[PDB]
C-alpha cells in the first residue's frame, strides 16, 4: 500500500527491536516511534493535532523530540502539535511530515517494550538427525498478529516436521527455505493476549547451528480510537485559529518488529 488520504491522515509508526537469551530472559529492547502527518487539502493546512490526554509528554524515557518547525512548548505543556510560527501552515501536498519522534530503551530483564515474548528449548531427536525444537510465545497485544514468521538459520535436506497437535496453529507451515537465510515457518494467527507453542523437528549438526532464531511480525489498524503499543494516540484534530472547531481525519496506528531475535 501507499494508503489512501481523504484530507488529513495521521500515521503512528512504531518499530520494536528485542533480543532474548535462548531460555527467554530479555537481554535488550528498543522501541522507535514516529507520528507523521499527511495533508492533501489546502482547507486543512491550518490544523493542529492534539494528543491523547493519557500520555506523559514530559516522561524522559520516551526521549520525545518534536520536529523543529513544531512548537516544543505547547507540546510539552498542552500535548498539542502546532506550528512554531502561528501565521504559517503545513504543506498541503500530501507529503509525510514528521512531527514527533520517540525512543524508549529497556535494560536486561525488563519486558515493558516486548509485545511478544519468546522462549526456546532444544533436545536431540529420535526421528531426525537433529533437534526437537519448541518455541513458546506469549502476546500482550490487544489485537491479533497475522502471518508471524519464525526463521531458523539452517537449510536442511530432510523436510522440517512440524509437530502438529503439539503446536497451537495447526496450519503452521514452512514457507521459505534458503541457503543464505535458513528456513522460515509461518504461523497464521497469534491472537490477542494468548500463549502458544510452535514445535518442530529439524536436521542440524549441533544446537548452536539453530541460532539466532528470528521472528517477524507486523500489525496495523485504521481505527480512530487506536492507541499504539506504547500508548500514543490522537484525541482530536482542530483548527489553528479556533481550537473548538474539530476537523475530519483518519489515523493509522502500526507496529513492526525489526531485529527481534533469540540468541
Amino acid at each position: 500500500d501507499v494508503p489512501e488520504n481523504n484530507g488529513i491522515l495521521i500515521s503512528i509508526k512504531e518499530v520494536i527491536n528485542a533480543e532474548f537469551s535462548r531460555d527467554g530472559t530479555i537481554h535488550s529492547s528498543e522501541l522507535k516511534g514516529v507520528l507523521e502527518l499527511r495533508i492533501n487539502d489546502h482547507d486543512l493546512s491550518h490544523s493542529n493535532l492534539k494528543l491523547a490526554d493519557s500520555i506523559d509528554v514530559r516522561d524522559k524515557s520516551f526521549q520525545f523530540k518534536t520536529h523543529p518547525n513544531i512548537d516544543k512548548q505547547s507540546f510539552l505543556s498542552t500535548k498539542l502539535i502546532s506550528l512554531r510560527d502561528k501565521s504559517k501552515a503545513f504543506p498541503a501536498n500530501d507529503q509525510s511530515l514528521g512531527v514527533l519522534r520517540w525512543r524508549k530503551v529497556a535494560p536486561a530483564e525488563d519486558d515493558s517494550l516486548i509485545p511478544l515474548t519468546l522462549t526456546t528449548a532444544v533436545s536431540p531427536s529420535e526421528s531426525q538427525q537433529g533437534f526437537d525444537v519448541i518455541i513458546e510465545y506469549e502476546s500482550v497485544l490487544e489485537t491479533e498478529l497475522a502471518d508471524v514468521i519464525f526463521t531458523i538459520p539452517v537449510f536442511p535436506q530432510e523436510p522440517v516436521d512440524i509437530n502438529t497437535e503439539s503446536s497451537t496453529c495447526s496450519d503452521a507451515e514452512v514457507v521459505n527455505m534458503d541457503q543464505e537465510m535458513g528456513t522460515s515457518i509461518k504461523i497464521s494467527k497469534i491472537a490477542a493476549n494468548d500463549a502458544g507453542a510452535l514445535a518442530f523437528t529439524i536436521e542440524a549438526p549441533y544446537e548452536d547451528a539453530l541460532y539466532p532464531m528470528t521472528v517477524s511480525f507486523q500489525e496495523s489498524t485504521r481505527d480512530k480510537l487506536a492507541k499504539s503499543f506504547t500508548g500514543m494516540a490522537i484525541q482530536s484534530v482542530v483548527m489553528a485559529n479556533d481550537h473548538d472547531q474539530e476537523l475530519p481525519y483518519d489515523v493509522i496506528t502500526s507496529l513492526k518488529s525489526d531485529e527481534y531475535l533469540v540468541q
Binding site: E36, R84, S87, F90, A92, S96, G98
Partner: peptide, 9 residues
C-alpha cells in the same frame, strides 16, 4: 526524509 518539510504561507 519525512523530517525535512517547510512551513508554507
Amino acid at each position: 526524509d519525512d523530517w525535512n518539510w517547510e512551513m508554507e504561507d
